[PDB]
Design an enzyme around this catalytic site. Structure first.
Site, mmCIF file in Angstrom:
data_model
loop_
_atom_site.group_PDB
_atom_site.id
_atom_site.type_symbol
_atom_site.label_atom_id
_atom_site.label_comp_id
_atom_site.label_asym_id
_atom_site.label_seq_id
_atom_site.Cartn_x
_atom_site.Cartn_y
_atom_site.Cartn_z
ATOM 1 N N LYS A 198 14.585 -12.145 22.304
ATOM 2 C CA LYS A 198 15.272 -11.556 23.455
ATOM 3 C C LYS A 198 14.481 -10.357 23.947
ATOM 4 O O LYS A 198 14.304 -10.218 25.075
ATOM 5 C CB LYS A 198 16.715 -11.164 23.054
ATOM 6 C CG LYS A 198 17.561 -12.327 22.517
ATOM 7 C CD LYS A 198 18.950 -11.947 22.319
ATOM 8 C CE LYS A 198 19.806 -13.119 21.770
ATOM 9 N NZ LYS A 198 20.925 -12.407 21.082
ATOM 10 N N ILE A 199 14.093 -9.426 23.052
ATOM 11 C CA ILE A 199 13.270 -8.270 23.452
ATOM 12 C C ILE A 199 12.005 -8.672 24.149
ATOM 13 O O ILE A 199 11.645 -8.164 25.255
ATOM 14 C CB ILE A 199 12.973 -7.396 22.185
ATOM 15 C CG1 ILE A 199 14.260 -6.789 21.721
ATOM 16 C CG2 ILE A 199 11.883 -6.301 22.456
ATOM 17 C CD1 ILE A 199 14.140 -6.249 20.274
ATOM 18 N N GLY B 75 18.692 -6.860 19.450
ATOM 19 C CA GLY B 75 17.881 -6.609 18.267
ATOM 20 C C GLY B 75 16.922 -7.750 17.895
ATOM 21 O O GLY B 75 16.115 -7.560 16.970
ATOM 22 N N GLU B 76 17.079 -8.913 18.506
ATOM 23 C CA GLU B 76 16.327 -10.114 18.173
ATOM 24 C C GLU B 76 15.013 -10.081 18.950
ATOM 25 O O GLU B 76 14.978 -9.836 20.170
ATOM 26 C CB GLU B 76 17.123 -11.381 18.552
ATOM 27 C CG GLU B 76 18.411 -11.604 17.754
ATOM 28 C CD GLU B 76 19.647 -10.837 18.302
ATOM 29 O OE1 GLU B 76 19.594 -10.193 19.323
ATOM 30 O OE2 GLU B 76 20.705 -11.006 17.748
ATOM 31 N N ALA B 77 13.907 -10.376 18.269
ATOM 32 C CA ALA B 77 12.605 -10.305 18.900
ATOM 33 C C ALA B 77 12.512 -11.254 20.077
ATOM 34 O O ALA B 77 11.909 -10.917 21.091
ATOM 35 C CB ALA B 77 11.474 -10.568 17.910
#
Ligand SMILES: Nc1nc2c(ncn2[C@@H]2O[C@H](COP(=O)(O)OP(=O)(O)O)[C@@H](O)[C@H]2O)c(=O)[nH]1
Ligand SMILES: C[C@H]1CCC/C=C/[C@@H]2C[C@H](O)C[C@H]2[C@H](O)/C=C/C(=O)O1
Ligand SMILES: [Mg+2]
Lengths: 193, 155
Positions: free
Chosen positions: A103-104, A99-101
């Site tokens: 990581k995405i 959910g963390e930007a």
């Protein structure tokens, strides 16, 4: 010696689900997995008994080992002849997207390099592919997360991607096809196995 | 969304929102609340620079920016400054009111608001309406005083 090795294997997977690092550490120390990014990624890819959220958590760590696993894991996927959304639907079934930007972001860039290698000539640069991929993750959250109050229409989506194509615009029909796909079918929540 | 809340990982953003306060969706971990009839959304700044252009339209209705900083974190204060300044450089946030929460003031050795002010460069923001508030997000101290100031700036 066979019932015994199978028991250690089952225990490694349980330990992975609890703490990815530690489970991989157990497998490697017990000689059931080679400690290379390539072999670890092959272990994760469609691995029985592995929690897809754990897989995603492990792939999203910043440590260099994990970024090498992430690239080898991406490398296992076959994205030829797929449009971006179809390919993302495959990639995102293999693990639960964090959910963390941060990581995405890293995961979309990695996915992008392989998408372009599988489909040369679809996009002019990998950055265009990577930014568009990220905008699809934004669009899936925008449309289907109920906490997002007002949703992007097509027109907002096409406008968001103005200029991502090395200064220029992608064809409106390509963006519309991605928009309509996500609008009528959210990325599925992955199930283990 | 009318107020955005930004800050480095571990600053205390999620903690503050639980003071102001579910179905699976693939994607970003959206945190948002209505407080006093105004939408507040945490805006996760964690990607690369390259994907910031995608953001733009989202900020058109944004009137205020909360920046949360871990006042006990001397090693990352400059990285916090750089992020604040990135946000204040967004065209769509040109007229946004800025509230800085100098958070974790409960910790014995935290930098005080004056020091945080220096280090985040607030005194250089001469054409911006800003305020800094000392806070402890776990106890709630300072939060509502800051939000009340921000509320009033919006009219
Ligand atoms: N000592 C102290 N801890 C805090 C304070 N605010 C948040 N925390 C803690 O700091 C950590 C990170 O807070 P969180 O809200 O998750 O940060 P985020 O990444 O900005 O959302 C958590 O362990 C919180 O309980 C504070 O004012 N004082
Ligand atoms: C209004 C909604 C739209 C959802 C899609 C937007 C995603 C943003 C992309 C940014 O890099 C991080 C997300 C950023 O944190 C967005 C939070 C949020 O609530 O945004
Ligand atoms: Mg948080």
């Amino acid at each position: 010696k066979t019932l015994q090795r199978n028991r250690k294997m089952a225990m490694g997977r349980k330990k992975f689900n609890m703490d990815p690092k530690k489970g991989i550490q157990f497998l490697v120390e017990n000689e059931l997995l080679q400690n290379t990014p390539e072999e670890i990624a092959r272990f994760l890819y469609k691995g029985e008994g592995l929690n897809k959220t754990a897989i995603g958590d492990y792939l999203g760590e910043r440590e260099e080992l994990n970024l090498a696993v992430l690239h080898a894991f991406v490398d296992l996927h076959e994205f030829t002849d797929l449009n971006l959304v179809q390919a993302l639907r495959q990639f995102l079934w293999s693990f639960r997207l964090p959910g963390e930007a941060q990581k995405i972001d890293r995961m979309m860039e990695a996915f992008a390099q392989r998408y372009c290698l599988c489909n040369p000539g679809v996009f002019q640069s990998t950055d265009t592919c990577y930014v568009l991929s990220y905008s699809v993750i934004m669009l899936n959250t925008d449309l289907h997360n109920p906490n997002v109050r007002d949703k992007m229409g097509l027109e907002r989506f096409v406008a968001m991607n103005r200029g991502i194509n090395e200064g220029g615009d992608l064809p409106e029909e390509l963006l519309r096809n991605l928009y309509d796909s996500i609008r009528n079918e959210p990325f599925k929540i992955p199930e283990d196995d | 969304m009318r107020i955005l809340m930004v800050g480095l990982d571990a600053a205390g953003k999620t903690t503050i929102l639980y003071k102001l306060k579910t179905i699976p969706t693939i994607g970003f971990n959206v945190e948002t609340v209505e407080y006093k009839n105004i939408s507040f959304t945490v805006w996760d700044v964690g990607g690369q620079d390259k994907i910031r252009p995608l953001w733009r339209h989202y900020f058109q209705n944004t009137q205020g920016l909360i920046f949360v900083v871990d006042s006990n974190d001397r090693e990352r204060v400059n990285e916090a400054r750089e992020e604040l300044m990135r946000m204040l450089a967004e065209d769509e946030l040109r007229d946004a009111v800025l509230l800085v929460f100098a958070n974790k003031q409960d910790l014995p050795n935290a930098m005080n608001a004056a020091e945080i002010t220096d280090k985040l460069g607030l005194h250089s923001l001469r054409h911006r309406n800003w305020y800094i508030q000392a806070t402890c997000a776990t106890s709630g101290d300072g939060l509502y005083e800051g939000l009340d100031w921000l509320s009033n700036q919006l009219r």
